[PDB]
């Protein structure tokens, strides 16, 4: 059947970054107080959306999403080669089209399934999956930067 | 502009209008097809400042009064959504700012208390040393109390 | 001898002298030592067109 | 037979730069007190990925 669904995303709002935003801002403050590095850097929302876009287009993200989606598991015949081929095909089913601001077109993601409800639900779940992965990566980055700053302050 | 060009904005606007409600036939597939058809009836053409042309929006309906009223209502709808989003962003930024300011004030209070405690201890030790050496002359140096903590003994 | 001995004892009791920068750094280190509050499941995107 | 596999990489993160990041940052501070280094210079992870 090969039904298709489309989603268009943008940078998150300040309110949906939870506490993370504030924490990141705090660290930025220190990077301005010592070791001048501001250089009118992109906002926290821009970095979060950059990480989200990186996760959305990632081959590994699509592979790991399909491996646990309960829609791939049903279409498993028990043969390793056939399962690998189907996994590769469904990884190729998800496509990411980056947008450029010159013609006011935003980043889009298209998913292909065998039915319309599947095409909708799987795309929603994949976007949530990529967002969660990006959030986890951002939290790990925040932990690393916080530890480095704490070490530097202790030494000082 | 982002609200104007958004697919979601057009979808909700058409859902909340009587123009779409009166054209519903009760069949879910037909209603969805009609909604999708009318979403494409609103076209946003971004402007170009180089050619001195501004952003425009075109709405297509089945009657001229409908084409006028629906476009006016849709522009108002997009403006209201943009205003709500801007208010949410302002509230989030305000909360972040007040959290940061509260933390800064707490740090300033802690620093002041630490300095005050250090001066307390220095004064107490200087008094004990002066009473040990019977320095009761009440005057040993011309400068005022703004002496270093190590030189506070030069007072009776 | 008396004034010098008193100065020696006072300096021994008081200890090293620190400036305002040291206290500010100490307070900032105290706030850094509590650690970041890692809240998961925060959204890193917003929908301009939701899947349908 | 001629089978083929592909990998796609990007810049590392502060977390898996180990201690190295911190060390490098320290030196960079010593390079901005003296000679001023460069205010707009590539980050530590950028240089690490360039070498990789």
Residue numbers in the entry:
A (entry chain C): 53 to 208
B (entry chain B): 105 to 260
C (entry chain C): 261 to 312
D (entry chain H): 53 to 104
Describing publication, verbatim:
Lipopolysaccharides such as the enterobacterial common antigen are important components of the enterobacterial cell envelope that act as a protective barrier against the environment and are often polymerized by the inner membrane bound Wzy-dependent pathway. By employing cryo-electron microscopy we show that WzzE, the co-polymerase component of this pathway that is responsible for the length modulation of the enterobacterial common antigen, is octameric with alternating up-down conformations of its L4 loops. The alternating up-down nature of these essential loops, located at the top of the periplasmic bell, are modulated by clashing helical faces between adjacent protomers that flank the L4 loops around the octameric periplasmic bell.
The ConSurf analysis also revealed an arginine within α7 (R267) that interacts with the downward facing L4 to be highly conserved. To investigate how robust the alternating conformation of the L4 loops is, we replaced this residue with an alanine and a glutamic acid in two constructs. Although the change of this amino acid is clearly visible in the cryo-EM density map, replacement had little effect on the overall octameric structure of WzzE or the alternating arrangement of the L4 loops. Although there are only small differences between the native WzzE and both R267 variants, these variants do underscore the nature of the alternating loops in WzzE, as both structures of the mutants were solved independently using reference-free ab-initio starting volumes and clearly display the same pattern of alternating L4 loops in their unsymmetrized C1 maps as the native WzzE.
